[PDB]
């Protein structure tokens, strides 16, 4: 099952506030797994603003 | 029982921010089941903005 | 106990965004029970905007 | 322990959106206990807007 | 562990909406412990608006 | 596992509302561990506003 903040970091990618770097900071923080970051990046960045 | 982000992706369809493609990205990500996507699409898209 | 999205659909009725039809779509989706829809409709629709 | 929507209905009283009637509709709906409604009404109504 | 509404009442203190009186109403309501109120008051009131 | 308010205090750092002092108040309150504060500070402060 996913990290507690997966939905939070996925939302920030989809609303265009998060960057590639931020997600990696979260990976090294342990708030996301590497696999989760790669999954979030598979979404259209800033899709909510389209 | 539903995927953790079902209510999140249902809300984005109902508020008119999500698209058909986005839901399918979530299906292949494993954040939604195929059945859940098809269920969300059964709702009036952008119903909150009506 | 109630469906996960009961509080969500109750809020949308109370803030005047949801309709009678939408609640029934949710009933047939299985995101609300028939009894839950009938309960939500017992509230003043758009009570938050009054 | 409290009804799931206690914090929701307490917030609506504190932000000045809920009324005495609404809380009682929730009591008869079973979304709040009578004791919970009486507790919420013990707070300053619309305290967040003060 | 903390009362369900601890994070809610802490947020209202930090965003400058809650007062000393409100927190005490919550103490007597049983939505916060006395110790929790005293803890919340240890934060800079309206810190989010600074 | 993390303190209940970790995601809350991480969000306030990322949206630029929280300060170094605030996080330390939360450390001494016991709403965050020292390790959690140091982790939150490893993120770009006010990253959501960038």
CATH of the domain at F32: 1.10.10.1530
**What is the DSSP annotation of C19-46?**
-HHHHHHHHHHTSS-HHHHHHHTTSPTT
Q: How far is A29 from chain F (nearest CA, A)?
A: 6
Q: Taking CB atoms and an 8 Å cutoff, what residues of chain C touch B42? A: 25, 28-29
Q: Residue B37 is encoded by which pair of tokens?
A: 């996507």
Tokens of E39: 């803890």
Angle among Cα F17, F20, F22 to the nearest 5 degrees reads: 65
Tokens of D12: 């609506």
* Nearest Cα residue to C36 out of C6, C8, C13: C6
* DSSP H or E segment with residue B26: helix B20-29
C8 touches chain D (CB under 8 A): no
8-state DSSP, F3: -
Which among F22, F28, F31 has the least Cβ separation from residue E47? F22
User: What tokens does F17 get?
Assistant: 């509302």
End-to-end CA distance of chain F: 30
CB contacts of F50 in chain A (<8 Å) are 19
**CB-CB neighbors (< 8 A) of D42 in chain E:** 25, 28-29
Hey, is the C-beta of C10 within 8 angstroms of any chain D C-beta? yes
Phi then psi dihedrals of residue A39, to 5 deg:
-70, -45
Cβ distance F25 to E48 less than 8 Å, yes or no, reads: no
Classified as helix, coil or strand, C18 is coil
Task: Count the neighbouring beta carbons within 10 Å of the beta carbon of residue A1.
Answer: 5
Experimentally, the structure was elucidated by X-ray
* Count of C-beta atoms within a 10 Å radius of residue A26: 26
Q: Are E46 and D49 in contact (CB under 8 A)?
A: no
Question: Phi-psi bin for C3: left (phi > 0), alpha (psi -120 to 50), beta?
Answer: beta
* Inter-chain touch F48–A12, beta carbons under 8 Å: yes
Q: Do C31 and B10 touch (CB under 8 A)?
A: yes
Using CA atoms, how far apart are residues B8 and C41, in angstroms rounded to an integer? 23
**Resolution (Å units):** 2.1
CA-to-CA distance for F45 and F12, rounded, in angstroms? 9
Decide if E42 touches F, using CB distance below 8 A. yes
How far CA E14 is from CA of A25, C13, D9, D12, in Å, comes to 27, 30, 21, 19
Interface touch A47/B5, C-beta < 8 Å: no
Chains that touch B (3 or more CB pairs under 8 A): A, C
Chain D: residue whose CA lies nearest to C6: D5
Rounded Cα distance between F19 and F26, Å, is: 11
Compute the Cα dihedral for D7, D9, D10, D14 and give only its sign: positive
Cα(D15)–Cα(C22) distance, rounded to whole angstroms? 27
Q: Residue F3 to residues B4, C13, E33, F7: CA-CA distances in angstroms?
A: 20, 34, 18, 9
Domain that holds residue A42: 1-50
Look-up of token digits 């996913």: A2
- Residue A15 near residue A49 (C-beta atoms within 8 A): yes
C-alpha–C-alpha distance, residues B11 and B13, integer Å: 5
Q: How many CB atoms lie within 10 A of CB B42?
A: 12
Structural domain count of chain F? 1
Tokens 């389209």, residue located: A50
**Tokens representing residue E42 in the block:** 């240890």
Judge contact between B30 and A47, C-beta under 8 A. no
């Amino acid at each position: 099952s996913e990290s507690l903040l997966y939905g939070y970091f996925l939302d920030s990618w989809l609303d265009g506030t998060a960057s590639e770097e931020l997600l990696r900071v979260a990976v090294n923080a342990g708030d996301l797994t590497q696999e989760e970051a790669d999954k979030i990046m598979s979404y259209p960045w800033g899709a909510w603003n389209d």
